[PDB]
Design an enzyme around this catalytic site. Sequence first.
Site, PDB file in Angstrom:
ATOM      1  N   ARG A 273       0.802  -1.238  -0.056  1.00 40.17           N
ATOM      2  CA  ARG A 273      -0.045  -0.047  -0.025  1.00 40.17           C
ATOM      3  C   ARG A 273       0.954   1.207  -0.091  1.00 40.17           C
ATOM      4  NH1 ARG A 273      -2.475   0.263   6.143  1.00 40.17           N
ATOM      5  NH2 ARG A 273      -0.427   0.415   7.178  1.00 40.17           N
ATOM      6  N   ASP A 274       2.151   1.138   0.148  1.00 43.09           N
ATOM      7  CA  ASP A 274       3.026   2.155   0.599  1.00 43.09           C
ATOM      8  C   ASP A 274       3.623   2.467  -0.970  1.00 43.09           C
ATOM      9  OD1 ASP A 274       2.713   2.611   3.359  1.00 43.09           O
ATOM     10  OD2 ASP A 274       4.245   0.724   3.441  1.00 43.09           O
ATOM     11  N   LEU A 275       3.215   1.663  -2.100  1.00 46.66           N
ATOM     12  CA  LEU A 275       3.699   2.217  -3.300  1.00 46.66           C
ATOM     13  C   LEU A 275       3.344   3.252  -3.905  1.00 46.66           C
ATOM     14  CD1 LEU A 275       4.944   0.317  -5.754  1.00 46.66           C
ATOM     15  CD2 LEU A 275       2.811   0.142  -6.682  1.00 46.66           C
TER      16      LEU A 275
END
Lengths: 638, 630, 259, 209
Positions: free
Chosen positions: D53-55
């Site tokens: 989700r940190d992409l």
Amino acid sequence: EEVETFAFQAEIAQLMSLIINTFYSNKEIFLRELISNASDALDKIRYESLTDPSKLDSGKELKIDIIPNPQERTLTLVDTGIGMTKADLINNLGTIAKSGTKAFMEALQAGADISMIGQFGVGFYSAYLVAEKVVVITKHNDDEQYAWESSAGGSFTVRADHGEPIGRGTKVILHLKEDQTEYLEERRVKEVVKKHSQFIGYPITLYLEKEREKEISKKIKEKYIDQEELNKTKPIWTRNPDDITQEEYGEFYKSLTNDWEDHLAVKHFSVEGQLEFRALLFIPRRAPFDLFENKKKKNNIKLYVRRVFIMDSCDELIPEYLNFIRGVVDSEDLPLNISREMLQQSKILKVIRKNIVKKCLELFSELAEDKENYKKFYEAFSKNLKLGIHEDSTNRRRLSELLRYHTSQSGDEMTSLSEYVSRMKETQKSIYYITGESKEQVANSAFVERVRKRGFEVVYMTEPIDEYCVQQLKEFDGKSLVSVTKEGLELPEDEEEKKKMEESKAKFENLCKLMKEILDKKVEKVTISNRLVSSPCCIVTSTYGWTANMERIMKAQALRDNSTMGYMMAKKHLEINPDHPIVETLRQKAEADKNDKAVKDLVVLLFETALLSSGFSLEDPQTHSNRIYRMIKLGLGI
Amino acid sequence: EEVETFAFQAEIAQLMSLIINTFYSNKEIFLRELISNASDALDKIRYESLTDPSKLDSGKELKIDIIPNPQERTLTLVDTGIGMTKADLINNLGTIAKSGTKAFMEALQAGADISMIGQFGVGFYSAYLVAEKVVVITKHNDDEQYAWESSAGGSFTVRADHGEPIGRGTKVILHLKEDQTEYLEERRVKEVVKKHSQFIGYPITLYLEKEKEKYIDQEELNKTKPIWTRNPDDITQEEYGEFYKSLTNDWEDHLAVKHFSVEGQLEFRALLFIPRRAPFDLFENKKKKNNIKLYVRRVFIMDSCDELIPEYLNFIRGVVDSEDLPLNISREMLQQSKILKVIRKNIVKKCLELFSELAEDKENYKKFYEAFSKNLKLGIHEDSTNRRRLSELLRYHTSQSGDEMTSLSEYVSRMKETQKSIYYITGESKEQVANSAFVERVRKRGFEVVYMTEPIDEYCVQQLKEFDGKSLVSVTKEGLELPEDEEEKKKMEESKAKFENLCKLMKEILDKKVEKVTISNRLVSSPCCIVTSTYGWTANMERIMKAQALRDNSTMGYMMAKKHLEINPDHPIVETLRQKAEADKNDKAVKDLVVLLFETALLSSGFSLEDPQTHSNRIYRMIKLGLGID
Amino acid sequence: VDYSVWDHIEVSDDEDETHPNIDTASLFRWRHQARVERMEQFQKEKEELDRGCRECKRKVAECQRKLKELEVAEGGKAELERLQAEAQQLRKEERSWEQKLEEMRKKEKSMPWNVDTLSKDGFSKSMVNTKPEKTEEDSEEVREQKHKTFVEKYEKQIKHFGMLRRWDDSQKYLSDNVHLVCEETANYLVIWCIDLEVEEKCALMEQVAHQTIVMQFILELAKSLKVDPRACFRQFFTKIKTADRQYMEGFNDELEAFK
Amino acid sequence: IKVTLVFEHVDQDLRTYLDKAPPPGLPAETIKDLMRQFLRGLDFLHANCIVHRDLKPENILVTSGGTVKLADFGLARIYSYQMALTPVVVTLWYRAPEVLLQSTYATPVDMWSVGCIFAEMFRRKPLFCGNSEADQLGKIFDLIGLPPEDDWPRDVSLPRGAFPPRGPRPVQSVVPEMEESGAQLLLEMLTFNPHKRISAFRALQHSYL
Ligand SMILES: Nc1ncnc2c1ncn2[C@@H]1O[C@H](COP(=O)(O)OP(=O)(O)OP(=O)(O)O)[C@@H](O)[C@H]1O
Ligand SMILES: Nc1ncnc2c1ncn2[C@@H]1O[C@H](COP(=O)(O)OP(=O)(O)OP(=O)(O)O)[C@@H](O)[C@H]1O
Ligand SMILES: [Mg+2]
Ligand SMILES: [Mg+2]
């Protein structure tokens, strides 16, 4: 003593476990072999109905359907083929190394066009690689419906008609293992069948739970997927080349590989010899970004047997320099081993490769006629050509004719070496060329000045692969190739002008000697050459070793620090232009005072700039620039 | 009732032909299979004699004798095993997928140090890949001597033998096919022997009709012995050296050796060796990757180092001998290749440990590094998971060093208390970068740089972004940070204003030759110098990349780094130019000088010269002016 | 007959399971992390299930002790009944923790095989071949034994070298027979040339003389380089095959003198 | 002479691409390719259950051949060397509401992130730009529309219901050269509710691409 005679025996209990456990490593062959068997049964019908249409009274449609059942963790294969009798279930299906395809091999004397796929009588039992149990419900037209049943536990059973309409072919129930549920996935099924059933004559469909909008119609979508699409790509090479047009052939290419543009160049290859096979060769309009990424496994030319994907070993099917041609090779005469995953007697592929290469060369030659698309082809794969020339010495006879270059006379038009040759002068007994870093470099090089003055055409070469090709191509059309960058550039010229040069050599004899002393350990020999016009001098490469460009290439590209080679290869000389004002002055200055250090320093300067103009890196560019700065300061009064 | 039960059947007539046609690909393996069986029987004897030594009365020697017979075009293999009873000949030998090896192994369940193979029960029939007919003559200690004859035609016969007696074991007569006479060749036989039987525990001999042309007992045929099977603590260096030299055939012994064994589902023993010198074909693209070979029970299976080890470790020689792998029915191929990947991973770990300990031995490490640092740097480039470990092994020449290389950590230990980055410079040679203007101010500020003189350093340093928490910085790129004394900073800002219009003029002169013209204190002895933008190729990288034959030139639209002209405001030339700008910014001679200076800087800074001819032509013109020519 | 035990091997750096749009330089590391986190979660679960089981075990064990006490107690059998029911519940709880542990055992059975579960470091032993002690042997003494037996032992191999001409064959030959790269070999070749002269085999003599100077060349610069000839003989072939003709001729004259 | 090859790694960060990219109206066809390159990559990642989700934009590589390569799969294996001090505090216009809601990673989360990135590509400029997570949603909502506490997920750390409802703003007209089909795909990706979004596969297989 008394000779006792015994028949060979077999421990079926051990054998069966070996069949399942030790014959295969890739469980994807599960669906392949199951489908193959279904298609064999369909072939059996085709023949029987061919000679007797009433054989289709219990069903005409010929196809293979696959229906997964996740709620059971089972798979269903629907074979609409001829099926098996009770006796066949017991005899053929229930016997190791027993196949009814052999019966058709012998029976079908009239059915010469009926080609069954495979014949070991074992592959059925590979079903148990992923299945815990297999049930085969079938009704051959000559018998009733029976349900063969076994978990491969040393025995099998056959049951009577259970009422589930099987009036043709067979229903194969595949009870999957707890850890084989991945074969219930649409994606996984597709992955397998796309690599193995790609060219099955009969259409394969899937019945899948269709992803759909919630059935709240408000909205609703269709409940199931009919995946006929799996066999949308048909065999093309099987048809007559003369009757195959681009309207379908180009579509095949775009289906062959995900490329939404028609191919550049193609060649059908039909072999009627011992190794009967047909093949389609395809050349892309554009080279791939991974063209030279040799870390990746090749898969352009694929090998099919009886239209079934078997191998893709391009390493054997083609040569490295042809690793851009994509295609299909399809033979029905190949000796595959028991697993069918590898062709026995690789010498077969050696012959096949040779034959394919011959057609590749013929294609290239055909393309050469189409200058426009040839240029496109050439540019797209000129490196591959040049790599082929570099490596494949045998076919240079053809590959070297495909070469195209920019020359001093053709300029911006790229032309054939054969055109170069056909347009050579009566004194032009050799092909003059120059290699370098770029076109405008070599086109403005001192090396080609006199050459142009003598009316000779210079082939401009700029790639490192060009530098490699000239280490392999020595003669073309009977004439040798001569680099204008090397010492001894014997241009055809007036003997009287040669005499003038000899008089000039005497004139500048002491100058050359002085310069040699000045440049001791800098240059191997200081001399005079009329190849130079506007320059006072020029560092040249010798007849042996690496050229300035070759050194650049090898020293920076090679991962091996072969200082021994580099040492031996590092050869060069200095040529003098006796007509140049500076050279003339230098002679006068030497005569005035050979010990005038300022003159000596000038010679060194010129040497260093000669190295620069010839592409030779300076051993210490900083000191060169320092001299420049000193000279600048002198000009500035600093 | 509604269901009938049947036993599975097997059409032996077809099956047999499948066995000797489709089950195998290579045919020379018939020696391996027969020899393996022989050694199994020799182990059978050994075990049995452990319980009753009088079983050795019928011969006390365990070996395999190979006696070719060109006069018949046959091959006699004498196996001095226990032998087979008539019952065994008709039950085990003449049966598909059956072997008494298993039954013997069942007897071995009572406790033994015996190790046999033969779980398939078919290898015998591989003899018919080559031989037209095979005759097996045997004498079990508990039975008479019998002759077992068959051409694999669905049947076989057994009769009591007559004439020459067999003390024990069995003889195999291979009636070699007419086109299989190549197996009568010494070389061909030895080829296969060295291929699969090089570590057979029992003596295998080859008899050749040589001086007087009599069968000479080549006892040394398989004299090579297993070393990893022995206790490593009891193995001396001389023994490891001789093994290595035998392993590699290199007269020079190894630099280092390491035994490695694992236990569990995966179980093996192994020897890893580091060579003292690199091979001349180390980088050959088409070189067979067979430095470390894979064995099962000392039986050669494969040598695919392409997957066994990393390419950057493709120099380590050795043997990995597993205890139990999932071999296919064709032993030549191993099922579940992920096993090899697991093995690889464990090997890599041990190689790295060996390298670390080798590094502790500074002197031999230096020797190692000098020979294999390219592979180390390759690993930095290729391996994203062990890069950190590999970076510990890196060694470079640096400003405060001599010709002795130093680790990056050693560099770090010499960093200043305000130094947050590792200074370095790449190039073609140490002298070149040592004489660069870019490291002059760095030296004036008391800093050390790392000298990087290989072309592969461009790939290595690409991955060396941070080391021991310290960043890295090239002196050749824009944004070179060196200690800025606030006083000097003010003076530099004053200098920027002083030479502001001068820089603008230079830019107008060289608008399309340089992206930006500015002064910089990175320079000391040079009036000016060209630097590389932080984005794109360096002068060095660019030059190197443009030497690649198979490069894609269109990718340079993303790699052509900006060039900027650094000016050193302290020089008389630069000051003169400023004054000349004030005198006349439109002075052509001055403009020519600016162009000259740029090309001079560009060239001497290691950047490609657009036209060496024209450049030198300018020089020739200036020379002519000095000479008074014109 | 059953290799199914290795059908579930997990390799976090499996380069055969990649994707064109994914950078595996970081993906493999993601796989590593995920594998580890999974194992951590697994272990935590198992430990908590074991803890809970043991707690309920002790609770019911103590209740059972109390059941005996309540049975003995004069009228405590009313409480006994109550406690028995509670003890049964504690046993049922214990049981369910054990059932969960049985499920954990099932999970272990389903667990993927990897470098942490397939095997352990059974044995590890390094060794760096430093030494064999700064020393020196009298090469004349060595030759007294070697020249007499080595030369005869490999006489045919020495002769084989002497019968070569192609530089590739000579290099490959010595690669296979590197033990021949020494003075004893060259000395034989000189003697052999003399014998060939006597036997009127001048054509061979010349070729042997050629190979004589090749071995002498190897010896020549091996001595100049202060290295073992066998460690650098391939560099002579590298030099010969790359040297400029004029320099090569000069080297050949120096070589003939060295012989 | 032996032959051996060595290859250069591509450092052409999407951010660099965007810096090199032309003004608002970035060729939709180029983006379509890059979109399906990205989404194809996602299908693989979803198949391998890759959590990230940190992409963010900078974790997306755009090669010289126009290939999208994904890297840096979540904080758990990234930033092992010098990083940002405000990797989160920074305007999270490229993070899904589910990130802003402090929930978790999902197919819709990932696609929401890149959905804004795709709009950024078209604009050569971040789609949204807020301060806090609630303010970031306050900018997100201006395009996708906003409902009260009746279309919010359970995993919400933000004061759901305190976000005054508003209409959507036709993505087609808001984002430069956003062909309606892609506008719908984007709007689906941008939709607040993660279960009203479109999967990577579905978007990948959409005729738009
Ligand atoms: N779906 C099917 N329909 C009809 N017959 C089948 C089917 N599956 C198996 N069989 C029987 O099995 C026989 C051979 O199958 P099997 O695959 O085992 O051998 P093969 O296909 O001839 O070659 P291979 O053994 O390599 O597959 C067929 O001749 C047929 O009698
Ligand atoms: N030298 C020998 N002495 C005694 N018996 C032997 C000898 N060689 C072979 N045999 C017998 O031959 C029989 C056939 O076994 P075979 O070797 O074909 O199977 P295997 O080779 O043990 O199994 P695999 O096929 O896995 O090698 C065995 O039962 C064994 O007893
Ligand atoms: Mg079949
Ligand atoms: Mg055996």
